[PDB]
Ligand binder design. Structure first.
Ligand SMILES: CC(C)n1ncnc1-c1cn2c(n1)-c1cc([S@@](=O)C3CCN(C(C)(C)C)CC3)ccc1OCC2
Length: 840
């Protein structure tokens, strides 16, 4: 390659955090094969995008204006404050007017046609053939009662986005030679054996075991494990799962490679160790640490192409109506399979139908592909996100089954792709092969829209930086995106990466300078300021896009306002000046850098919270959640958005009584009244407290994270309650302590108007979520599988079934949640005290 070609690859390696040209941990060429394969999908999307619209990336929805936003429009009139340098003029606009129309009514209101409306202080453009009511920034201002402020400037030049040009009927058997680990402690007396499983979509097609032997550094067997399944019956995507029991170690091997070739020859596989079921157990990558890991040595030596009776119908309809977690009896599977063509008429049956396929039989697999040829009902069906996500989880390894799921995602608009982007990225872990329709879909949508591409960058990079199991696959996908996003975005990502990596280093250096066991000294703060002083000059980039808020550009550090938080983790509290002079306020941009909690769990929770917001929006319900920004950037390290004018509920308590323990009921209401500028703003804060407390009580109860220490609950000075710090997990279903009830005017068995409103809001929000039970269940199970240490498959996932009271009518569901509110009233301060004791 050319000299600049090598320098460009080094540029990509720095952005990715991993060298895709490094081949220290591969036993085939699938990764390089995938790099070539993703060239055509990338270039096809680069060729299809409009240069002007890609440069301005308008954030737009097609959903109707919610009712709670329509009543916020007084006279079918929306006010836009248009700025031109130091001047400003207010314009009345119809909710259906387009940006081009309101631009015309602006110049006409005077008495060259190449200007653009941009949000003041943000890289957010109000352009395109779209009603102004369908811009997300307009709806954000409507919901929060902010004035729509816009500047009149020049569109960004699409030339900046330039992309650089490219340049056997025999039974299956495996020989288990032995296992090897370099060092083993002298002590104890341990036995060990090897379990060999043929797996497809977590179905165990066949299983064989070796004999148990004493556990030494080298254990040898030299046995043939002969299975009953024939070679010609091995489905594509099937895994040879090898596991050592004393479960201690595991490793997987694709029996059919990316070229439809049966795996053959000698293999020395370095295995993963179980830390003292989940997505990591499905990876075909081997342990990169080949010096100290357990290895297993095997030998492979063994090509593809190329009406119901009314009572049985009732049983089938009952099977289809059950939740995605309901286990399928063998009788149920034979029912779904034999009445194949009736099951095809029910889109919600497809997950259970394909779980009834005998994937270990080639003739049955062929019958399944014949079934999917007549796909009229599925192609015409309305897009069901939850249904589609079921077909992309760990239970389906067939490429054609997963392909028809990705086909349905193609109709998602950019607004909804952003809602599910994080989950779709995680679902790549469930793909048997590196190059898949799901991976190409993500690549496609990220290249089509700069906001999707921005979050796709940081979602992929988060896994690359800390997931040994999937960093190789995600790095090839990220490289494919970076080679098509354009020069301007490559420049932006470079500025962001250099900033976060410099701040990551400062974060780790500060935490080693202090201890959780002790308090924050002026010494530790002085160390921080000196380190930031060295970064600032020199050299910190002049500005960078905020990773969790790409519309915001942060400038220089305000070092005088930077400090180390008094928490146990000693996270950094950083504040940056805003680099956009057209901004309305001189407010700083606050960013928290924290080590070390798994912020990937925070990411998953906050994204589900935003999904619950969209669910409630479709029912004209506003619950006033506050899903702040949060992005994991490495192993137990990442960044968090600073919400202004907010404090923790524990700090409000301790402001009065101080490092106990003995919580008081009236302190929260006193705090809200003190922080309220007027009585009118105070009453609005209490109203916002009622809604947000109900929204979080319902949301945290469904997700099973309701029992929280009030140090992890925050409140804004404008009354917005919100939970924080999810990288963690007598009892309570949620937090509804006497201080919360006092704000609502209630104190121990005394129903107040605000508390009755809280009860009615909770029930309505709860019933609204139950109409999306299957969606919430699939998001919940996927979250445990891709974000948690280890997941019990059949029980941990079972909690949300009872929480969503599956199978009960709305009356029993309503009483169920009202009883949960009563448990909190009966428990009082008890559970909070036990949490405080747990943290003394
Ligand atoms: C608690 C922290 C471990 N954590 N862990 C995970 N997630 C979080 C988190 C998330 N958020 C916050 N924390 C947050 C905290 C505070 S207060 O703690 C802060 C108030 C300001 N003071 C100064 C001005 C420096 C004296 C210090 C204490 C204020 C605003 C916040 O933004 C909302 C999102």
């Amino acid at each position: 390659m050319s000299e600049e070609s090598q320098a460009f690859q080094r540029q990509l390696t720095a952005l990715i955090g991993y060298d895709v040209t490094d081949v220290s941990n591969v036993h085939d060429d699938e990764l390089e094969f995938t790099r070539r394969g993703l060239v055509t999908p990338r270039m096809a999307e680069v060729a299809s995008r409009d240069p002007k619209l890609y440069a301005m990336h308008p954030w737009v929805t097609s959903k109707p204006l919610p009712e709670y936003l329509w009543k916020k429009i007084a006279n079918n009139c929306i006010f836009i404050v248009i700025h031109r340098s130091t001047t400003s003029q207010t314009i009345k606009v119809s909710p259906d007017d387009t940006p081009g129309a309101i631009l015309q009514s602006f110049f006409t209101k005077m008495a060259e046609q190449d200007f653009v409306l941009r949000v003041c202080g943000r890289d957010e453009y109000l352009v395109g053939e779209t009603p102004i009511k369908n811009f997300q920034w307009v709806r954000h201002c409507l919901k929060n009662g902010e004035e729509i402020h816009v500047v009149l400037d020049t569109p960004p030049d699409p030339a900046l986005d330039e992309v650089r040009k490219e340049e056997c009927d025999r039974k299956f058997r495996v020989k288990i030679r032995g296992i090897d680990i370099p060092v083993l402690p002298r002590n104890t007396d341990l036995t060990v054996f090897v379990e060999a499983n043929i797996q497809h979509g977590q179905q165990v097609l066949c299983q064989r075991r070796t004999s148990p032997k004493p556990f030494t550094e080298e254990v040898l067997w030299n046995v043939w494990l002969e299975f009953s399944i024939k070679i010609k019956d091995l489905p594509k995507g099937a895994l040879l799962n090898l596991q050592i029991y004393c479960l201690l170690y595991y490793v997987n091997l694709l029996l059919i490679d990316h070229r439809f070739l049966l795996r053959r020859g000698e293999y020395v596989l370095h295995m993963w160790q179980i830390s003292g079921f989940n997505a990591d157990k499905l990876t075909s990558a081997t342990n990169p640490d080949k010096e100290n890991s357990m290895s297993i040595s095997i030998l492979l030596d063994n090509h593809p192409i190329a009406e119901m009776p009314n009572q049985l119908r009732k049983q089938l309809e009952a099977i289809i109506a059950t939740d995605p977690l309901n286990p399928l009896t063998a009788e149920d599977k034979e029912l779904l399979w034999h009445f194949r063509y009736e099951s095809l008429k029910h889109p919600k049956a497809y997950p259970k139908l394909f779980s009834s396929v005998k994937w270990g039989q080639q003739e049955i697999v062929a019958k399944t592909y014949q079934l999917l040829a007549r796909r009229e009902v599925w192609d015409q069906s309305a897009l069901d996100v939850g249904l589609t996500m079921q077909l992309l989880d760990c239970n389906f390894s067939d490429e054609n089954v997963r392909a028809i799921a990705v086909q349905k995602l193609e109709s998602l608009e950019d607004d909804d792709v952003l809602h599910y982007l994080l989950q779709l990225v995680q679902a790549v872990k469930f793909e048997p092969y590196h190059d898949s329709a799901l991976a190409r879909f993500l690549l496609k949508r990220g290249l089509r829209n700069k906001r999707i591409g921005h979050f796709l960058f940081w979602f992929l990079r988060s896994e690359i930086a800390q997931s040994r199991h999937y960093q190789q696959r995600f790095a090839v996908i990220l490289e494919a995106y970076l080679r098509g996003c354009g020069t301007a975005m490559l420049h932006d990502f470079t500025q962001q990466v250099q900033v976060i990596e410099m701040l990551q280093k400062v974060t780790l250096d500060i935490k080693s300078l202090s201890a959780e066991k002790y308090d924050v000294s002026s010494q530790v703060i002085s160390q921080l300021k000196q380190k930031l002083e060295n970064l600032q000059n020199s050299q910190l980039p002049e500005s960078f896009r905020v990773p969790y808020d790409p519309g915001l550009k942060a400038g220089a550090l305000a070092i005088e306002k930077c400090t180390v938080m008094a928490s146990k983790k000693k996270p950094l509290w950083l504040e940056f000046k805003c680099a956009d002079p057209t901004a309305l306020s001189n407010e700083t941009i606050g960013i928290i850098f924290k080590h070390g909690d798994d912020l990937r769990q925070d990411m998953l929770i906050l994204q589900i919270l935003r999904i619950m917001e969209s669910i409630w929006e479709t029912e004209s319900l506003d619950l006033c959640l506050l899903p702040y920004g949060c992005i994991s950037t490495g192993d137990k390290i990442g960044m968090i958005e600073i919400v202004k004018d907010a404090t923790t509920i524990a700090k409000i308590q301790q402001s009065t009584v101080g490092n106990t323990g003995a919580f008081k009921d009236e302190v929260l209401n006193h705090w809200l009244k003190e922080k309220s500028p007027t009585e009118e703003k105070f009453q609005a804060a209490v109203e916002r407290f009622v809604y947000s407390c109900a929204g979080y009580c319902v949301a945290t109860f469904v997700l099973g994270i309701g029992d929280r220490h009030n140090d992890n609950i925050m409140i804004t000075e404008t009354g917005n309650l919100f939970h924080i710090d999810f990288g963690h997990i007598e009892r309570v279903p949620f937090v509804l302590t006497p201080d919360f009830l006092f704000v609502m005017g209630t104190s121990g068995k005394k129903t107040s108007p605000h508390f009755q409103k809280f009860q009615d809001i909770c029930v309505k929000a709860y019933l609204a979520l139950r109409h999306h039970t299957n969606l919430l269940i699939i998001l919940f199970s996927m979250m445990l599988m891709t974000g948690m240490p280890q997941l019990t498959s059949k029980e941990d996932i079972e909690y949300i079934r009872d929480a969503l009271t599956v199978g009960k009518n709305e009356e029993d569901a309503k009483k169920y949640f009202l009883d949960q509110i009563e448990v909190c009233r009966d428990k009082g301060w008890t559970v909070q005290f036990n949490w405080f004791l747990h943290l003394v």
